[PDB]
Symmetry: D2
Subunit: 241 residues, 4 copies
Amino acid sequence: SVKGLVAVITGGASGLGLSTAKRLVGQGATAVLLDVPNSEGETEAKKLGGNCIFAPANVTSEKEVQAALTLAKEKFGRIDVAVNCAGIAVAIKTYHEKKNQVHTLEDFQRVINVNLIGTFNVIRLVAGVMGQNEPDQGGQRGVIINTASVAAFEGQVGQAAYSASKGGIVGMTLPIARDLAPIGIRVVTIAPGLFATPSQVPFPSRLGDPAEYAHLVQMVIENPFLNGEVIRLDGAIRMQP
Amino acid sequence: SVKGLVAVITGGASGLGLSTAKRLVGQGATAVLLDVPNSEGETEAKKLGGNCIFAPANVTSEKEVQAALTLAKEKFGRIDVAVNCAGIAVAIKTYHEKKNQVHTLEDFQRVINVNLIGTFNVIRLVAGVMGQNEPDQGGQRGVIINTASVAAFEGQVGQAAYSASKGGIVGMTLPIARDLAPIGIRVVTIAPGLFATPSQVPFPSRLGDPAEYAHLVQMVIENPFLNGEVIRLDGAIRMQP
Amino acid sequence: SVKGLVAVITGGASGLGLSTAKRLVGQGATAVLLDVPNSEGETEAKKLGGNCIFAPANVTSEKEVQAALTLAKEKFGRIDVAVNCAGIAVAIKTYHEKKNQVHTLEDFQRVINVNLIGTFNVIRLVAGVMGQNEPDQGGQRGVIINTASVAAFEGQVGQAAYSASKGGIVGMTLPIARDLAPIGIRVVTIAPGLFATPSQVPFPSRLGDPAEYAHLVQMVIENPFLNGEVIRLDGAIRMQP
Amino acid sequence: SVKGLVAVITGGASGLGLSTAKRLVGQGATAVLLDVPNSEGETEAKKLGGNCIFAPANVTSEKEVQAALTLAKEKFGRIDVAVNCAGIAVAIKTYHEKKNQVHTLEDFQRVINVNLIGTFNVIRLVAGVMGQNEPDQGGQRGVIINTASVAAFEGQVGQAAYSASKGGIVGMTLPIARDLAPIGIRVVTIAPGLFATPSQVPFPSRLGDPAEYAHLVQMVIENPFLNGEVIRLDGAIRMQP
Ligand SMILES: NC(=O)c1ccc[n+]([C@@H]2O[C@H](COP(=O)([O-])OP(=O)(O)OC[C@H]3O[C@@H](n4cnc5c(N)ncnc54)[C@H](O)[C@@H]3O)[C@@H](O)[C@H]2O)c1
Ligand SMILES: NC(=O)c1ccc[n+]([C@@H]2O[C@H](COP(=O)([O-])OP(=O)(O)OC[C@H]3O[C@@H](n4cnc5c(N)ncnc54)[C@H](O)[C@@H]3O)[C@@H](O)[C@H]2O)c1
Ligand SMILES: NC(=O)c1ccc[n+]([C@@H]2O[C@H](COP(=O)([O-])OP(=O)(O)OC[C@H]3O[C@@H](n4cnc5c(N)ncnc54)[C@H](O)[C@@H]3O)[C@@H](O)[C@H]2O)c1
Ligand SMILES: NC(=O)c1ccc[n+]([C@@H]2O[C@H](COP(=O)([O-])OP(=O)(O)OC[C@H]3O[C@@H](n4cnc5c(N)ncnc54)[C@H](O)[C@@H]3O)[C@@H](O)[C@H]2O)c1
């Protein structure tokens, strides 16, 4: 049961984060959608009812993230779960022979900044807020769930920046779970294959449905012994160049 | 929901398999406990009621496994789910200086035979039975779940035979999911850390509870996009020598 | 330098084991080719000269492997390096549609027996012989090198038996290095992609040359800090179903 | 043989990079040490003789890196090998409860900038220079070796920023090898355990010697089929929290 838990979901105005908010609110939880101001955040939070609110913030900004977390804790009293779905992608080769073009340093830095530095920024600030909760009967104070990708393991031609950012999330999953063990905060990462959001797959032979990602997030929230691990959700695909 | 599904659970008279049967029968499924004749399978199946029966069989025998699957079908009409939990262990070094003793070939063989060959024997025979089912709305005919171990990744001193056996389960998970993709049978492996069955864990700091392994099996049966993957269930532990 | 070292190479009459023997004998080492009686062992050993002999033995037999190691120690005085290249393969689906044929238990059993049980049998017996050597200046008494495959990570359709046998070699690499640490024996595993022995590779775009596997074996023998690890040698290929 | 090859080595004034330059120049290659102005680069380059020069540059600056690569090409004629060893480390928890301290965003950003963004900056600019070379007989134009760490797989308490930076190097290794396949440039990554540079390990039981990392670099340069892979060099250690 997720009934009564309070969750903050980055990238909550669209695709995987939105579908995660719809499932948890439908099971009795409260959700805060953290997304940029020009998104559809406000009207999705209105459609979802009085137990879902919108908080505008860019995940690379310390000040905007801090204000969104303060808002959640005042509206709902505490924070129990955080899910990181905010992210961007590009498709640019390291070096393109035919156009004789070199990947810019600025396009690499931008993808690292939103995807990897932005996910650590949310984790570092939300951990101190969860630390304020009273431990449940098993010593737990919170759960943090991150979104990597199968490109951390089989990155394709044109994915060097994206793959570097997602491999960085995979790499920090264990040390962050070991750091937060003493205060009872579990840290788990999901790595999606190809999903239908804004025939290579063995079975089922189709794009993933965002509601299948949401079901896996609920399982992770409910199981108390899952921690410091990365789980592939991809219909058994292995990516080719 | 697992309501109305039919599941065969090897090693179902004790520990992880028994706890899995309790959970699935309590959610409305039917369960067949496949375990050795001298186990307590019969009285555990009686305690769970009319939707749980016992089928005595050794997983290394072709004839006994076939007769157990024929019984399940005769009684319940079909097979939807199979869970492999039957397994044994030894603690013997490859070579022990102190007593000048080499590990015997016979003790390695026995562990491989029960753990790895017995798991493939159940997989090959149950696939033909699941292949008889009409596909659901998503093209699925069944789900097979195996039990490996964190020893497939950090085997300790004395675990060479056990690690070989569980490393073989990990290695065959993807080729078996690729083989059974055309008929809609998913194949997923769970790798448990230390569990309380017949100080080192980061969080929670205790042995796992068998009911936590059962909850993970139920969520693997429910999520349609999880396939060809291995999932660690271990409290974030990493084993030392 | 491998000059003067004594090596036993299983599967030495052909392909990767033969090419390994040619390189090491070329650099001043002595080699013993362990392979079945019906192979070309004897004439390859004669072509390579007086520092290369043939010892007929099936790796699944305790008695014949023991006799081959006794011959090597008798003839050359000691054993410093062991290389496991003996192996077989099959292409059989777990359950085959068009012919309605289930994978036999006997075909799975035979691949496991030669590839995984036969590699452990050589390891266990050669460790005691290496243990007889006086330690060098860095405390080392020997080095054991095994041959797995990229099929341990991306097994294809029809590779379930082979993948299981090679995943078991990967799984036991670390516990066996941990077991043999106290007497100074290093244990490393190589995982080849596709080699030219009896267009999908990124670069170089061709099958591997057996002489490239032999160069990597020499590098492993010479580097003192490489231990308990698996190395892919494959042109950056990742296998599709 | 590396005789005649021209290598650019970042972080070449100290530790792993310096030992690598010593070995390669000793075998007849030419080396360019790329390191910061405050280092001892100039006097190490002078001690090694006329086939070793110093080029002051910060890897985070594309103007300084471009000027260093231009100096190497004009002085020696071409660039055949690039080794990335430049790197820094910090030991700071994500959150510390007793002192109520949150990891700063700036300290995480700094480590990502030098270790991950600086390595991609060197890779993107050196690739175009290697592309100018005439392909050898096997179609190769160059080789790029990166330095990650065992902290990409077992990060400890306090290593969240360092682990994220090294996990990013691991994750981009395959997409960069796939990108550069068409022009014959191999891309491989080494992951060192604990080394004696400016108790525990199974065997040998000691810190690694920088000369052992240099020997592995040479073998990666000489083997033509090693590509898109990560190799652990750590005495079989597995890191605890
Ligand atoms: N759809 C797929 O196939 C897929 C596959 C693998 C991984 N992913 C990952 O899943 C996550 C969700 O992606 P999605 O498919 O739902 O995409 P999406 O575009 O539909 O949703 C991502 C949301 O993140 C928000 N966002 C972007 N930059 C932000 C910033 N700086 N601050 C705050 N919000 C920001 C966007 O505005 C958007 O609403 C991402 O991390 C993505 O990399 C998606
Ligand atoms: N408990 C742990 O810490 C742990 C950790 C990792 C992996 N595992 C694995 O979990 C699985 C279940 O283990 P467990 O802890 O419940 O042990 P358990 O002893 O309680 O149960 C295992 C059951 O398997 C049955 N079994 C054994 N050999 C059999 C055979 N040849 N044919 C049929 N049934 C047979 C036994 O009779 C027993 O009832 C095993 O595969 C074990 O290797 C357990
Ligand atoms: N060639 C490839 O593409 C490739 C790729 C990956 C892994 N491998 C592995 O490389 C190893 C060598 O294979 P190869 O390509 O050189 O094949 P090969 O057929 O040319 O040589 C293998 C040798 O092992 C011997 N052998 C077989 N069964 C034996 C037994 N019971 N006892 C003793 N010797 C026995 C054979 O007689 C043969 O001489 C095998 O383990 C194989 O699985 C090969
Ligand atoms: N020593 C170990 O135990 C160890 C273990 C794992 C990985 N590593 C990695 O090995 C590599 C070599 O480290 P080391 O142990 O030899 O350390 P070191 O400090 O001895 O040498 C690294 C060098 O990098 C240079 N450097 C730092 N920042 C730079 C920048 N912005 N631009 C250019 N040069 C810069 C420094 O001036 C120094 O000379 C690093 O990437 C490190 O993370 C080391």
